[PDB]
Structures are given as structure tokens and as C-alpha cells.
């Protein structure tokens, strides 16, 4: 017998009350048959007319087996119920699973009909099975056991299973039991001979506490197909991914394609989806057809080529240290690889650039490092030792000049194309013997005598070409001044592209701000 | 006897989510919490309690033993407005003028006093699991929480009874209790202050009060190039808002027009006198008793961090500068963390409140790296969002 959890309605809300619309004769015959069987087993107990609460029943014949089953809509009952700690919604990532000699999948059977329910709350879960016409008011039933579809069934069953499994985990500490939904995943380092005995002992424990489990013969054998992951004995791979070859492409098709490619990126290295997501920028009808641009077609060709090869990941041995490599890609794509030993990869991924944002490659690298750090914390619990393209001196220059606070875990320098380094290379002091420049948002006034926010950007660009290699400029606008300051090597905007192209060649360019002043 | 604790009218308890933590922190929290439950301070809760409050493990005074900080800010926003109005804590003003002020942690006392049965449920915390292996072990605080404002309010009667003999013996000592901290301030010399603090520690320990040093006495040749005068007039326009007597119109006339950036310009006489008058002008501290103090941290680089505490903008109540102090470790996260702690302690000794912080760092970086370098029980309300300085 399992102790019940105290559950109550939300403060100030009465029990559900809904009326049951009439149903056909075949449906009521099936419903009374199944309900009488359940009452004989004991899940539902008939209650008299004292209870005024009703929750309607809808009879459905599932296409398989041609049998009429019962589905009760508890939506109203779910609304009129105390809040419960949401069950964890993140599936265990296969990368963090430490390899064990034998692993079994024990799927508990009819669990929500085995964990019981609180006596006070049994009253509101009353459903009516109508009689033919109005000869009798009908049959009235209540639920002694946890209903299906109720808000709190997952949390209550999870707590019940945890309490039942706790003493077994205390007695046998080597066995590791993962819980996800109803199933219990059990893994022990023991040989198969003792492991079968231990799994039988777990089954008998759950049977003495009332939870049925599958038999020894019916337990699944490797490989396992779980939430899109194929878990082999010594490798984890995503399920076979078939990219659609449809010539026509709808917004829904592109959404599915991007979702599939993002799911594939976790093991497949080099999957690029940036162009497709740019195709999906704006809202459109799912029937609306967006033609594949040339850039997106190139992206889909390279992605399909990558998906042709099979790639497999490896599980986690805690002794060795995690190592993360970030490899630069075109534009703002950043492919990151996590591997404990070389050429065997635990997980691959991508960091897409901030949509509609132009930033320095070093700042994008910093964001990528932070994303890797948080993902590694969540999955494994330790931050990796990074291996980054950027040179230490470039990082130090940007770190000291930048106004925010940026830190990166222990990292080292890997030599590979491309290498991230600063391009603007601005200085902070005026140059003697160099032309001194004034800009006003496209006119230029000069010591030599030579004579809206984007306009200042245009004006500050015009300053560079005229002056030459060594320049000293002052700008009337802090916006253009900040654009040149930010050292944006992304070159997303066209005007900024022009400015960077002209700036890279120059040997020494220093720019300062002069406020507008009363008088000449 | 349990005292009635009530949330503010029409406010729901905390539901905040928990931040994933490292395996070492999870193991330390698990062992600490298991021992604490065996002692009786925390007890298990099932799924019927939805409320949650984060748990962070910090290492104190670079010692081996881990400690636990429960970020009870969301619960404090609701409960303290009930308890502080109902019970309150007076603030001594002499702590500013005291030559020496010391902080003694007092958290062990709250581990003895019980708590209201109904209010227990709103103090719930979870210890996360790596890779979603198991649902987190959830707990509730049966005994008075450590780090939740209102625990000093509930324990104030006992604290007064426990400090009355010592305060009667020593009239000059000034003692003020923010949450889990006692501020002892003496005008005596520093050695005598050490002796008095030792005497206070012995007194508290003998009365069953277990406990484990900022100095308040100690606000901040060649004619210049044309662009240098431009830099000065830029600072003029910047500081026009801060002080009204500041004036620009005479240094401006020197740089008016197009000039060479390396040109050497002698000052006009009126411009030089105007520079002197501006300096004289440079050379609204009215603290609103009820306001949200906000402190802005500005990274000047080179291991220097300037802060400004102000209630309404352009009326600074205090300005200062903090310099880097560790040559072995240079990370901006740690430097910002120590800046925040020092600013908060100075604010606590000067006025009652702990400021809201506008931090320069970015959101995820702070969220990932604050717990490693935090060394204080209190947790201020920070906005990771920064403004470009
Ligand atoms: N379908 C299904 C399914 C089956 C097992 C799962 C699982 O098993 C473990 C359970 C406990 C510890 C380690 C585990 O896995 C180690 C790694 N591992 C994985 C597979 C094999 S065959 N052998 C092996 O060593 C953990 C999480 C999800 C699971 C889903």
C-alpha cells in the first residue's frame, strides 16, 4: 500500500461540474462492460447521488484492436487542483551516460492505475455513464486511483516511484536507476549472471509494492530507440534522418528541415542552417511557398552531403578531462566539438550568430564559450578545457579595451584556418605630421584646407579614403564614432563594410569626439 | 512559541527556477543537507508544494568547509515588507563616524528558533541532478531560515536580551544587525577593538550564540593641444548636469574652428581664469528614507572600477573608486564581485539598505560565475543589464 499525497483545489474554487451529452447504445454497452471490469478489479468504486460533481466521459474506439476504450476529459478538474512541482521536462542526454556492462529497460505497466489517490480528492473525480434515453439517471462512478490526464498524475507517480525505489538504491549502491516517464532504466557494472538476479529482485520489490513490471523474456535488447536517439552498446547515434527532396517548399517544410538539421547537428559535424533560418525570417502562411535562394540551395546541398556519412558518438568515462574545440565557419557560424580523447567525439554543435547583430569575432567567440560552458555544466557537470582559434595577445587587447566584463575558462591556442584577430586596429593618440580631419554629416573640412546616424557613418567613411595611410579624424557624431570604436569585423551592414574595407589597409587611424559648440 | 508569518496581501510564494550547478557543489550541498535533516532543521516535501527558491553553494573565508546560500530575494520582497513594518530594525547613525567597524556572522542562532507551520511551505529549495538523472531532492525549512529578511526581526527580542549586558558595560560600542551580520563599531584604537570584539564573541558563545574589519574613517606644465582642449570641453558638457556652475564658453573659443590635432595653443587669459573658476565650482545628499538605492559600476579598465550610488539620477549620494588588489587572479568577474561586496558593505554601514546594482557584466557570464567568487551571506538585487559608460 502506497501512502496518498494531500491534494486540494485552488483556494476559492468549487469542484468541477459538467453535464454529459447523450451517447449511442454501442458506446454505453462498451463503457458499462469496461467499467464493470474495472470496478471488479478495484480502480473505480460506485458512489451514490450524494456527490454533485460530474466530469464527462467520452468513449473512443482506437483504430487498432477495434475495441472501444474510455477517455475522460479532466481539463476542468486539472484547472480546479493545487499546483504541483512540474516534472522535469529535459530528457537525459545520451552523452553523459557512463558506460555500464548491462542495461535493462523496465517499463512499469498501468502505473497510474497502481499509485492511489487521496480520500478527500476522490470525490471530485466522478464520471457518469449514461443509460439509454432517460429510464434511469445513470451509473455514477469515482476514481480510487490516480486518473489519466489529470494535472498531477506525473508528479504524484514520480514521487511514489522515487519513494518505492529509495530503499533498493540504499541496499544496492552500485546500481544506477534512471527514471523517465513510466519506464525505469537500470544499469549495473555487475556481470550478467548477477545482474539478472538483481533485476528480478527489483521486479519483486515493485510487485510487493504493487507495480507490475515486464517479464524477463519481454525486455528489450540492444540497440534501443529512445526519443530519437539510438543507444548502442558502445555508441550513441541520432535516428536515421531523411531530408525531404521535395521541389516545392512551404514554410512548414522549411521549419521541419531546420528542426531536423538542428537535431542532426548534435552528432553530425558541420551542419549549417543559417540560410534556411534567414528564409524563415518573416511570418507567412504554411501554404505560402518561399523559393529556395541560391545561398540556401548551396546550404542544403552541403548539408545533404554531410548527412550522407554516418557518425557515432561515445559515452562518458569520468576519469579523463573534457576538451572542447571551437572551429570558425563562414559568417557567424561556429562549430563546437566536445571530445575526451582525440577523434572520438562526445557531442558536436553549432553557435548561430545573433540574428541581425554585427559584432566582433572575438565577442562572438566569447558568447560561444559561455554557451559551451552552460551546456557542459547542465549535461556533465564540469566545464571543459577550451581550445580556441584566437591568439592570446588578440584576446588580451580586446579584453582590456572592451568596457564589459568577459572571462573564459582555461583555454589554449589551436592553429587552424581561419584565425580570429582584430582588423580595425585603432589607436588612441593623435599622429604628428598627419592630416587632421573634420567630418560633418558628406562634407570634409581640413587643416590642409580641403573642403542621420548612418550619414555620419557615411561621413566618417569619406574621411578615410581622402586622407591616406596616416589619418587623424574628429567626428561630430558619437554614433559613427562608436561604430568605428566597436571594431566590428562582422561587416554585416553595407556602410560598415565600406568603412572596414578602407580601414584595414591604413597603418594608423585615430579618431576622437568633438562636441558641437556655440560660436564658429 | 511560533510567531504569525504572513505574506503580503495577495502575493504568491516564490516559484523561481534553479540554476544548474557543478558536481562538486551538488555533492557538498547533498552532504550538508543530509546532516542538517538528521539534525532536524530541514524536512522532505512531496510534489504537493510547488514553491521553490534557488540553492547555491559558496566557499567561505577560503576554508575547506562548503556553505550554502539560499537566494531568498523573491521571498524577501514579500515577507520583509510584512515583518519590517511589524517588527523593524533601527539604524544607528554613528557607524559612519566610528573609526573601526567589524562584521561578525551570527547565523547559528537562527538555527535554534522554530518557524510558523503555515509559512514553512513557502521556504522550499531543491538540489539539482546532473543530466536529469533523478528528480531533485526537495526540502523545506522547519527552523528559521538563514538569509531571509525577517529572521533578525523574529529573533530581535532574543538578540536584545543577549546583547543588553555587553552594551550596558560598553556604552561606546555600537551594534547593528542586518541579516546574519553584526556590525560592531568602536572609536577606540584598533587593538582595543580587537579585545572588545573578542569579549563580545565570548559573551555570545557563553549565552549559546555561536559566531565565527572595515575602517570607515579612512568621496572622490605645457599648453594643451587642440584635441586636448576638445577633450576638456567634452568633460565640461558631461559634468554640466552634475554641477550647475560649470561653464564652457571660454575654453570653447580656443578650439573653435578647424585646427591641427598636434597644434600647440596657448591659453587666452579669460580661458585660464575660467578654468580656475570651473575648478572652484567642482572643488543634494538628502537621503530619501524610502527609495530603491541603485549603484552603477563603470569599468575604467586597468583594474579600476568606479561606482556611483544615487536614488534619482544626477543626484549622486556617494561616489568612489576601487582598484584591483590581486595580481595572481585578474578576471573581471571576480573583480566585479568584490566591487559589489565592498559597495554593499559601505552602503550598509552608511544607510540601512543594500543597493540595487546595475552591473557591467553580461547576464549569462554573471549567472555562471558569481557563485565561485561570492563570499558573503547577503545577496543584492542585481541587473546584469549594463549601460554603455
Ligand atoms: N530505450 C532505452 C534506454 C535504455 C537505457 C538507458 C539508460 O541506461 C542506463 C541506465 C543507468 C545507467 C547507465 C545507463 O546507460 C549507460 C550507457 N549505456 C546505454 C545503453 C546500453 S545498451 N548500454 C550502456 O552502457 C540511460 C538513459 C536512457 C536509456 C534509454
Return the HEC string of A379-438: HCCCCCEEEECCCHHHHHHHHHHCCCCCCCCCEEECCCCCCCCCCCCCECCCCCCCEEEE
Q: Do A383 and A443 belong together in one domain?
A: no
Spatial separation of the C-alpha atoms in residues A219 and A215, rounded to whole Å = 7
Distances (CA, A) of A257 to A275, A285, A310, A354, B267: 12, 17, 19, 20, 69
Residue B124: inside a domain: yes
Q: Is A231 in the pocket of ligand 1 (CB under 6 A)?
A: yes
Q: How many domains does chain B have?
A: 3
| Residue-level length of chain B | 389
Question: Cell digits for A127?
Answer: 464520471
Spatial separation of the C-alpha atoms in residues B147 and B283, rounded to whole Å = 42
Residue A6: inside a domain: no
Q: Do B167 and B243 belong together in one domain?
A: no
Residue B211: inside a domain: no
- The DSSP secondary-structure symbol of A472 reads E
Q: Which residues pair with A184 in a beta bridge?
A: A106, A179
* CA A257 to mean position of chain CA atoms: 16
Q: Which residues pair with B126 in a beta bridge?
A: B138
Q: Is A315 in the pocket of ligand 1 (CB under 6 A)?
A: yes
Residue B87: inside a domain: yes
What is the DSSP secondary-structure string of B153-193?
HHTHHHHHHHHHHHHHH-SS-EEEEETTEEEEEESS-HHHH
Q: Is A239 in the pocket of ligand 1 (CB under 6 A)?
A: no
Segment holding A369, helix H or strand E = helix A361-379
Q: Do A371 and A388 belong together in one domain?
A: yes
At how many degrees (to 10) do helices A361-379 and B363-373 cross? 60
Burial class (CB in 10 A: 0-12, 13-18, 19+), A237: middle
Q: Which of A96, A172, A230, A231 to mutate for ligand 1's pocket (most ligand atoms within 8 Å of CB)?
A: A231
Q: Do A123 and A184 belong together in one domain?
A: no
Provide the annotated binding site of B for Mg(2+).
105, 180-181
- The atom number, within ligand 1, closest to the CA of A98 reads 16
Which CATH number fits the domain that encloses residue A54?
3.10.10.10
Q: Do B175 and B37 belong together in one domain?
A: yes
Set of chain B residues whose Cβ sits within 8 Å of the Cβ of A446 = 258
Set of chain B residues whose Cβ sits within 8 Å of the Cβ of A377 = 20-22, 368
Residue A333: inside a domain: yes
Preceding residues of all breaks in chain A (C to N beyond 2.5 angstroms)?
Answer: 441, 451
Spatial separation of the C-alpha atoms in residues A429 and B106, rounded to whole Å = 54
Distances (CA, A) of A177 to A27, A159, A169: 42, 14, 8
Q: In what order do the strands lie in the sheet with B100-105?
A: B100-105, B181-186, B174-178
Which of B49, B299, B302 faces A403 most closely, judged by CB atoms? B299
Spatial separation of the C-alpha atoms in residues B343 and B320, rounded to whole Å = 9
Q: Do B305 and B178 belong together in one domain?
A: no
Set of chain A residues whose Cβ sits within 8 Å of the Cβ of B365 = 370, 405-407
- The CA distance from A178 to the nearest CA of chain B, in Å, is 5
Distances (CA, A) of A507 to A372, A424, B242: 36, 10, 39
Cβ–Cβ pairs < 8 A, chains A and B: 156
SS3 of residue A493 by DSSP: coil
Residue A399: inside a domain: yes
* Determination technique for this entry: cryo-EM
A139: Cβ contacts below 8 Å, ≥ 6 apart: A32, A35, A46, A128, A129, A131
CA angle at A119 for the pair A116 and A124, rounded to the nearest 5°? 100
Q: Do A198 and A107 belong together in one domain?
A: yes
Which CATH number fits the domain that encloses residue B243?
3.30.70.270
Considering A269, A285, A308, which residue would you say is the last residue of a domain? A308
Residue A1: inside a domain: no
Q: Do B312 and B277 belong together in one domain?
A: no
Q: Do A127 and A159 belong together in one domain?
A: no
Domain boundaries, position B88: 23-206
Q: Do B125 and B232 belong together in one domain?
A: no
Which CATH number fits the domain that encloses residue A474?
3.30.420.10
With CB atoms and an 8 Å threshold, state whether B360 touches A518.
Answer: no
Q: Do B251 and B302 belong together in one domain?
A: no
Query: A418 preceded by cis ω (within 30°)?
Result: yes
| Beta carbons of B119 and B8 less than 8 angstroms apart | no
Residue B17: inside a domain: no
Q: Which residues pair with B182 in a beta bridge?
A: B104, B177
Residue of chain A whose Cα is closest to the Cα of B230:
A514
Q: Do A252 and A301 belong together in one domain?
A: yes
**What is the CB neighbour count within 10 angstroms for residue B234?**
15
Segment holding B151, helix H or strand E = helix B151-154
Spatial separation of the C-alpha atoms in residues B322 and A261, rounded to whole Å = 49
Q: Is A229 in the pocket of ligand 1 (CB under 6 A)?
A: no
Q: Is A313 in the pocket of ligand 1 (CB under 6 A)?
A: no
* CA A249 to mean position of chain CA atoms: 25
Amino acid at each position: 500500500p502506497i501512502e496518498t499525497v494531500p491534494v486540494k483545489l485552488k483556494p476559492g474554487m468549487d469542484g468541477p461540474k459538467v453535464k454529459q451529452w447523450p451517447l449511442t447504445e454501442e458506446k454505453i454497452k462498451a463503457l458499462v462492460e469496461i467499467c464493470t471490469e474495472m470496478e471488479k478489479e478495484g480502480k473505480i468504486s460506485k458512489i451514490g447521488p450524494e456527490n454533485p460533481y460530474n466530469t464527462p466521459v467520452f468513449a473512443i474506439k482506437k483504430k487498432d484492436s477495434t475495441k472501444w476504450r474510455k477517455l475522460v476529459d479532466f481539463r476542468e478538474l486539472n484547472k480546479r487542483t493545487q499546483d504541483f512541482w512540474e516534472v522535469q521536462l529535459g530528457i537525459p542526454h545520451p552523452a553523459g551516460l557512463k558506460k555500464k556492462k548491462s542495461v535493462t529497460v523496465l517499463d512499469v505497466g498501468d502505473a497510474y492505475f497502481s499509485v492511489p489517490l487521496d480520500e478527500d480528492f476522490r470525490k471530485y473525480t466522478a464520471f457518469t455513464i449514461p443509460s439509454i434515453n432517460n429510464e434511469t439517471p445513470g451509473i455514477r462512478y469515482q476514481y480510487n486511483v490516480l486518473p489519466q490526464g489529470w494535472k498531477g498524475s506525473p508528479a504524484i507517480f514520480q514521487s511514489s516511484m522515487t519513494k518505492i525505489l529509495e530503499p533498493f538504491k540504499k541496499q544496492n549502491p552500485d546500481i544506477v536507476i534512471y527514471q523517465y516517464m513510466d519506464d525505469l532504466y537500470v544499469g549495473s557494472d555487475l556481470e550478467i549472471g548477477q545482474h539478472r538476479t538483481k533485476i528480478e529482485e527489483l521486479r519483486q520489490h515493485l510487485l510487493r509494492w504493487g507495480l507490475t513490471t515486464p517479464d524477463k523474456k519481454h525486455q528489450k535488447e540492444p540497440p534501443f530507440l529512445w526519443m530519437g536517439y539510438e543507444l548502442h552498446p558502445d555508441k550513441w547515434t541520432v535516428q536515421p534522418i531523411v531530408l525531404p527532396e521535395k521541389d516545392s517548399w512551404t514554410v512548414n517544410d522549411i521549419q521541419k528541415l531546420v528542426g531536423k538539421l538542428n537535431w542532426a547537428s548534435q552528432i553530425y559535424p558541420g551542419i549549417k542552417v543559417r540560410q534556411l533560418c534567414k528564409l524563415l525570417r518573416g511570418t507567412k502562411a504554411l501554404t505560402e511557398v518561399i523559393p529556395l535562394t541560391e545561398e540556401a540551395e548551396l546550404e542544403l546541398a552541403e548539408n545533404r552531403e554531410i548527412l550522407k556519412e554516418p557518425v557515432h558518438g561515445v559515452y562518458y568515462d569520468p576519469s579523463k578531462d573534457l576538451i572542447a574545440e571551437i572551429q570558425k565557419q563562414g559568417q557567424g557560424q561556429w562549430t563546437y566539438q566536445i571530445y575526451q580523447e582525440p577523434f572520438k567525439n562526445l557531442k558536436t554543435g553549432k553557435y548561430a550568430r545573433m540574428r541581425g547583430a554585427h559584432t566582433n569575432d572575438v565577442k562572438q567567440l566569447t558568447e560561444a564559450v559561455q554557451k559551451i560552458t552552460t551546456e557542459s555544466i547542465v549535461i556533465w557537470g564540469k566545464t571543459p578545457k577550451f581550445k580556441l582559434p584566437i591568439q592570446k595577445e588578440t584576446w588580451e587587447t580586446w579584453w582590456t579595451e572592451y568596457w564589459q566584463a568577459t572571462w573564459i575558462p582555461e583555454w589554449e591556442f589551436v592553429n587552424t584556418p581561419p584565425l580570429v584577430k582584430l582588423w580595425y586596429q585603432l589607436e588612441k593618440e593623435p599622429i604628428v605630421g598627419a592630416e587632421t580631419f573634420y567630418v560633418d554629416g558628406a562634407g570634409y573640412v581640413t587643416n590642409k584646407g580641403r573642403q542621420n546616424q548612418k550619414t555620419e557613418l557615411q561621413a566618417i567613411y569619406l574621411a578615410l579614403q581622402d586622407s591616406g595611410l596616416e589619418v587623424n579624424i574628429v567626428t561630430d557624431s558619437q554614433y559613427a564614432l562608436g561604430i568605428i570604436q566597436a571594431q566590428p569585423d562582422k561587416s554585416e551592414s553595407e556602410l560598415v563594410n565600406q568603412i572596414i574595407e578602407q580601414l584595414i589597409k591604413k597603418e594608423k587611424v585615430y579618431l576622437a569626439w568633438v562636441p558641437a559648440h556655440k560660436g564658429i
